[PDB]
Amino acid sequence: NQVHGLKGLNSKLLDIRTYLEKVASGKLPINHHIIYQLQDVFNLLPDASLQEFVKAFYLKTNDQ
């Protein structure tokens, strides 16, 4: 499921990207609502990444 998400995420970014070039030159009709929402993704920019770790399994195998 995780690798399926990752491929699924790459497919998503491309639909939006290809479309903006087309607006930029060679005009397609646009809406104010879609254009704003896309800008927001840049503006939201994450903060810092921390935590999560394990090691538990080696004891289980070892005792076994």
């Binding site: 990207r17 930029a24 927001d40």
Partner: peptide, 25 residues
């Protein structure tokens, strides 16, 4: 600023977005 309000319709607004997104792709 957490959010900065999107720029009301222009050709320029569309151009700024495209390049950044391509970097991410």
């Amino acid at each position: 600023m957490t959010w900065v309000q999107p720029r009301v319709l222009d050709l320029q607004q569309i151009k700024g977005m495209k390049d950044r997104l391509e970097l991410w792709c």
